[PDB]
Design an enzyme around this catalytic site. Sequence first.
Site, short mmCIF file in Angstrom:
data_model
loop_
_atom_site.label_atom_id
_atom_site.label_comp_id
_atom_site.label_asym_id
_atom_site.label_seq_id
_atom_site.Cartn_x
_atom_site.Cartn_y
_atom_site.Cartn_z
N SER A 1 0.84 -1.20 0.00
CA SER A 1 0.00 0.00 0.00
C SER A 1 0.87 1.25 0.00
O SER A 1 1.75 1.37 -0.87
CB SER A 1 -1.06 -0.11 1.08
OG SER A 1 -2.12 0.78 0.88
N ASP B 1 -9.68 -4.62 -5.25
CA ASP B 1 -9.00 -3.67 -4.36
C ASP B 1 -9.67 -2.28 -4.44
O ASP B 1 -9.68 -1.62 -5.50
CB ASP B 1 -7.55 -3.56 -4.81
CG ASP B 1 -6.71 -2.78 -3.83
OD1 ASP B 1 -7.23 -1.85 -3.12
OD2 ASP B 1 -5.52 -3.09 -3.68
N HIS C 1 -7.79 -5.60 -0.91
CA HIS C 1 -6.50 -4.94 -0.83
C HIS C 1 -5.43 -5.68 -0.01
O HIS C 1 -4.27 -5.75 -0.47
CB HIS C 1 -6.80 -3.58 -0.17
CG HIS C 1 -5.62 -2.67 -0.03
ND1 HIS C 1 -4.87 -2.26 -1.11
CD2 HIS C 1 -5.10 -2.01 1.04
CE1 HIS C 1 -3.93 -1.38 -0.69
NE2 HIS C 1 -4.07 -1.23 0.60
O1 LIG Z 1 -1.22 2.52 3.11
C1 LIG Z 1 -2.43 2.45 3.32
C2 LIG Z 1 -3.37 3.50 2.81
C3 LIG Z 1 -4.41 3.91 3.67
C4 LIG Z 1 -5.33 4.92 3.30
C5 LIG Z 1 -5.17 5.48 2.02
N1 LIG Z 1 -5.92 6.46 1.32
C6 LIG Z 1 -5.37 6.53 0.14
C7 LIG Z 1 -5.72 7.31 -1.12
C8 LIG Z 1 -7.10 7.90 -0.97
C9 LIG Z 1 -7.44 8.89 -2.08
C10 LIG Z 1 -6.39 9.96 -2.20
C11 LIG Z 1 -5.03 9.30 -2.47
C12 LIG Z 1 -4.65 8.33 -1.32
O2 LIG Z 1 -4.27 5.69 0.00
C13 LIG Z 1 -4.15 4.99 1.21
C14 LIG Z 1 -3.23 4.02 1.54
N2 LIG Z 1 -2.94 1.42 4.01
C15 LIG Z 1 -2.28 0.20 4.55
C16 LIG Z 1 -3.68 -0.49 4.45
N3 LIG Z 1 -4.20 -1.15 5.64
C17 LIG Z 1 -5.64 -1.38 5.52
C18 LIG Z 1 -6.19 -2.01 6.76
N4 LIG Z 1 -5.48 -3.26 7.00
C19 LIG Z 1 -6.13 -4.47 7.25
N5 LIG Z 1 -7.45 -4.47 6.95
C20 LIG Z 1 -8.04 -5.64 7.13
C21 LIG Z 1 -7.42 -6.78 7.57
C22 LIG Z 1 -6.08 -6.69 7.85
N6 LIG Z 1 -5.40 -5.53 7.69
C23 LIG Z 1 -3.99 -3.11 7.13
C24 LIG Z 1 -3.43 -2.37 5.94
C25 LIG Z 1 -4.31 0.88 4.09
#
Ligand SMILES: O=C(c1ccc2nc(C3CCCCC3)oc2c1)N1CC(N2CCN(c3ncccn3)CC2)C1
Length: 289
Positions: free
Chosen positions: A116, A233, A263
Amino acid sequence: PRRTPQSIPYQDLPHLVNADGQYLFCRYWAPTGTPKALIFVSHGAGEHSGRYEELARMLMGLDLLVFAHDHVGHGQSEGERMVVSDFHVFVRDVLQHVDSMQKDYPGLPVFLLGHSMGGAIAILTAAERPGHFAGMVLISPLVLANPESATTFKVLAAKVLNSVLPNLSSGPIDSSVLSRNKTEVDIYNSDPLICRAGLKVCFGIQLLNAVSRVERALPKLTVPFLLLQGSADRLCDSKGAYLLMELAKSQDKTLKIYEGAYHVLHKELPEVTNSVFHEINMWVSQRTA
Ligand SMILES: O=C(c1ccc2nc(C3CCCCC3)oc2c1)N1CC(N2CCN(c3ncccn3)CC2)C1
């Protein structure tokens, strides 16, 4: 005594101090003998390095020395939560850690693994040191955001900035749409080291900066990579995975698409996560033989 945001003294914990004088919490997984290679694990927004325990243990089982830190504003590191002065700080701090580890293990190849936002950080780190990294493994890297989400955010950011609207952020991370594995969702939600607050406009702006910078970096990338992407995703649009395959100049590039997967591929349904682990194991094994 300088303490983590959870009030634990850094003197008791593995740490590093970044160029801004902030303490970053570190994590290491070292094999018993001489490692074959080093690998830095770069976590995403709102999470931290402890969420990679199982992946790191697998990689250490391949005789790699795995290392990580909590990015500034995350986990057990210092900093206002999920804020960064400029996205480049994350890359600078990765490069500090990599440089310091490399001098302790001179001559060993160094890989990057990122998910991510942490995948965007990996891409930008590799691009800042052309020809230096042995390989990167990218799990749903932030290359292109979901177009509707990106537009929503740009409109919000403009309102907030051009009408000085107060107490308004973007939404929090919605873990329930980011993995189909409900148990993993519940585990994530109750992790005391994540951030569950709304994404601040200033941090969103830095994530847009990351996306812009990634796009400029892609034509310059030569590092070998393995790219893993879910077709469903909702955050890192699969179109970005295809853009990375198209624009990177790397001679060794591979894409695996997981149909229907969300994702967080390394915390997904067991059939997907088991495959993810297997694919990473083979790809790294082949490149450290
Ligand atoms: O790196 C990110 C992430 C989080 C929020 C974001 N918003 C944007 C965009 C939005 C529009 C404008 C441009 C940017 O990019 C992101 C990246 N992360 C790491 C991810 N997480 C999700 C939750 N996780 C999870 N979820 C369920 C089960 C286990 N882990 C861990 C990892 C999200």
